Structure 1
Amino acid sequence: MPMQMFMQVYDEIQMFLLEELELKFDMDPNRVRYLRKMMDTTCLGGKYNRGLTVIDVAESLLSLSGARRKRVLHDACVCGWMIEFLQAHYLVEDDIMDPDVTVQCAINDGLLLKSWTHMMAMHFFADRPFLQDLLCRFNRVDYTTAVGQLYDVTSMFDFAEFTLSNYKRIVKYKTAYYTYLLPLVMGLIVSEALPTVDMGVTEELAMLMGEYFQVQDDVMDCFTPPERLGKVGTDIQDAKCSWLAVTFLAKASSAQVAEFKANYGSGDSEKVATVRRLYEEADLQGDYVAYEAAVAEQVKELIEKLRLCSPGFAASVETLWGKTY
C-alpha cells in the first residue's frame, strides 16, 4: 500500500511537470517524451529507501498523535519524491565524473532534476504553511551534501585528514544529512510536528546511522566480490578516506604505514591486493564487528530518549534503523 501509493504519486508528479512544459513552456512533444524517458531512467530503479522513509514517518504521526489524513500522506509522497529526484540529480553528476552531445545532455539532465524538485514543491505545497520553511531546510541539506562532497573528494589533496573524526565529518555532511536526517524532517513537517521532537537527539540519531551504514559499505567495497556487491570496489584505487584506512593507520606499525602509503591510491591490481592483505593482517574485520555493535547500541539507546517526548516517532526510526541493520 505505501509503495503502491508512492508510484501513483509519481504519475501525478510526472504528469504535472511534463504538461507544464507542453502548455506553459512551449516544448515540442519530441522533447517531452525525451524528458519522460529521462525522468524514468534516473528517478526509477533504486529501492526508494530515502523516499519511502518520509511516508513511514507521516503515517506514524497521524495515527499516534479524517480529511486531514489524505492530505498529509499525499504531502509525504511529494516530499519523498523530492529526495528521490534530487538523489537522481547527484547520480547524474556522478556519471559526468566517470561538440559532444551525450555530455551536454547529461549536465542538462542534472539541472532539470534539481529544478523539478522546486517545481513540484512550489506546486503541491503552494497552499501549505510550510512551503517557505521546507524549501529553506531542503536547500541547506542540498548545500550540506555539496559541501560534504568537497570534504570527500579532497580528502587527499590540500593522509593528514585520515582521522576517525574527519571520517565522521565526511559521512555527516556527504551522506548522513541526506539519508538519515532529511527524510525524517520532511515527515515531521508534513505532519506539522516539527517543534514537538528533540532535534538534537534526532540529529544525533541521524549521524550514527550514517556512520553505521558508511562503515559497513566501506568493508563491502573492499571485501565483498563484485558479483555479490553489485559494483567494482574502487575505494582503494581512488585513495578514499574509508573506515578501513583510518582504522589501519591507527593500529599499524611504522612499516605497515609505509607499505600502506606506497600501495594506496594506485590502479595496480597487485598494489590493491597488497592493501587488502594489510587490512586482513591487521584483523580489521574483527574490529569492524565490535565497532558496528558499539554504534548499534548507541542507536537503540537514543531511540528511547526520543520516545519519552515522541512515542510515534521512534516506531518509524526503528523501522529506518531496521533497513540498515
Structure 2
Amino acid sequence: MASMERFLSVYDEVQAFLLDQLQSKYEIDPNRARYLRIMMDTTCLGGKYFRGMTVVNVAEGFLAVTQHDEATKERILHDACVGGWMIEFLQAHYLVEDDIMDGSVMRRGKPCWYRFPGVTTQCAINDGIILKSWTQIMAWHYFADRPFLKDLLCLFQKVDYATAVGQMYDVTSMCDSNKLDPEVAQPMTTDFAEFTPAIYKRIVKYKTTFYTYLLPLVMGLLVSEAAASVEMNLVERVAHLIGEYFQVQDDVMDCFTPPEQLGKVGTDIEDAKCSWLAVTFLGKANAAQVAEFKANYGEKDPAKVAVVKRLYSKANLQADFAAYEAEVVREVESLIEQLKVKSPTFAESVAVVWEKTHKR
C-alpha cells in the first residue's frame, strides 16, 4: 500500500473511532456528531499533509533497513499514520484559533471555519479546543500499551507549548517590549528596533519549526523505536534551519504571490508583522527609505500598503533571498552529512524533507 492511501485510510478509521466513542461514552446525539464530523473534515483535510506524511516517511525509511514480522511493519505504519494525524489535528487547532485571533477571512481558498454561517466564533473557539483534545484521545487509545507512549506525549506537549509561546511572540512582534502591559492598550512600534534577524528567528523557531519540522521528525523516530540512531541536537538544529527557511518563503509569498496560489489575501503589511521582508528591508534601507517604511507600515489603507510593496521591490530583496537560500543550502547539507554518521536512513528522510521544502 502506498503511503498516502494508508494515511488517508487511517483518517477515516480515527474519525470513526472518535465519533463512535462520542456516541457510546459521551452521550452525543446524531446531529451534533455530524456537526463534529463536518468540523473535523473542514479543518483537518485539504492541505498537503506534509507534517503527518513526514512521520510516515521517516517510519518507512527505517522499515527498509530493520528486520520485522509483517504484522510489525503494519503496526509501525499504522502508528506513524496515527501520530501523523495527531500533528495534523494539532495544526488544525492552531489554524482555527489563529484565524479567529487574526480576524482572517480565508484559508486554502475557503472561508475560515469561524466564518461558516452555522459555526460563529462562539462555537469555533471551542471546536478548536476539541481538535487539540482529539490528539490526546487518539494517543491514549492507539498507543496505550506502546513503549514510546510517555516519550511521545511528553514531546507532543512540549511542542504544543512552544507553539503557543510562538504565537505570543508573533502577535506581540509589533509592540515595543518595554511597553507590554495588560493594563494599557498597545501602540504599534514607531522605531521598529525589534525587527531584527534574531528576533524574527525567535518568533519563527517557536511559532512554526517545532510543530512543522521537529515534531514530525522525532515522532517518526519514536514510533520506529529509533531515537538512538540519531543525535537529537542535530535533529533540532536541522529542524530549526529548515523551518526558518519555510517561514521565510511564506513571508515572501504573503506579499508577492497572487491570492489564488496562497489561498487568501495576504495582510502581513497591514498587520505590521515582523516578516522576513520587513527585517531584511530594514537591514539595508537608507534613512529616507526607513522613514517612508515607518509612515506606511501597519495601515489598512491600500495606498500605504502599495508604498510598502513598492519599497520592497525597489530594495532588491530577491538578492537578499538568494543569498539567504544559498547559505541555508550550505548549512542543511552540512547537517545532513553530520546525520549520516549515525543514520544514513534518517539523513535521507531529512534530505527528502529539505527537497520538498526547497522545491515548492
Give the match for residue 129 of structure 1: 147
Look up the match of 2:111: none
**Secondary structure in structure 2 of the residue aligned to 1:119:** helix
Match in the other structure for 1:155: 173
Equivalents in 1 of 2:34, 2:261: separation in Å? Answer: 35
**1:298 aligned partner:** 331
- Which residue of 2 is the match for residue 307 of structure 1? 340
What is the TM-score of this pair, normalised by structure 1?
Answer: 0.97
In the other structure, the counterpart of 2:130 is 112
In structure 1, what is the Cα distance between the partners aligned to 2:89 and 2:148? Answer: 20
Say which SS state the counterpart of residue 270 (structure 2) adopts. Answer: coil
> What is residue 320 of structure 1 aligned with on the other side?
353
CA–CA distance in structure 1, aligned partners of residues 225 and 59 of structure 2: 10
| Cα distance, 1:269 vs structure 2 | 1.0
Counterpart of 1:143 in structure 2: which amino acid? Y
1:195 maps onto 2:206 in alignment? no
TM-score where L is the length of structure 2: 0.87
Give the ranges of 4+ consecutive aligned residues of structure 1 lying more than 4 Å apart after TM superposition.
none
Q: Provide the C-alpha distance between the structure 2 equivalents of 1:212 and 1:101, rounded to a whole number of angstroms.
A: 35
The match for 2:94 is: 90
Q: What's the RMSD between the two structures over aligned residues?
A: 1.3
Give ranges in structure 2 of 5+ residues lacking alignment: 104-117, 178-191
Distance 1:263 1:18, change over 3 A: same
Q: How many residues align?
A: 324
Aligned position for 2:64: 63
Q: Secondary structure at the match of 1:180?
A: helix
CA distance in 1, matches of 2:211, 2:95: 14
1:145: Cα distance to partner? 0.4
Contact 1:212–1:296 (Cα < 8 Å) also in 2: no
- The 5 A counterparts of 1:1-325 are 1-65=2-66, 66=69, 67-97=71-101, 98=103, 102-157=120-175, 158=177, 159-325=192-358
CA distance in 1, matches of 2:337, 2:217: 16
AA of the residue aligned to 2:9: Q
Structure 1: tracts of 5 or more residues without a match: none
The structural deviation recorded for 1:101 is: 6.5
Q: Is the 8 A contact 1:43 1:88 kept in 2?
A: yes
Deviation at 1:29, TM superposition (A): 1.4
**Alpha-carbon distance change, 221 to 189 in structure 1, aligned in 2, over 3 angstroms:** same
Task: Among all aligned residue pairs of Structure 1 and Structure 2, give the percentage whose two residues are the same amino acid.
Answer: 69
One-letter amino acid of the structure 1 residue matched with residue 16 of structure 2: M
Aligned partner letter, 1:141 = V
Q: Which whole-Å deviations, capped at 9, do the CAs of 1:231-283 have from their partners, x for residues lacking one?
A: 21211111101111111111111121111111110111111111111112221
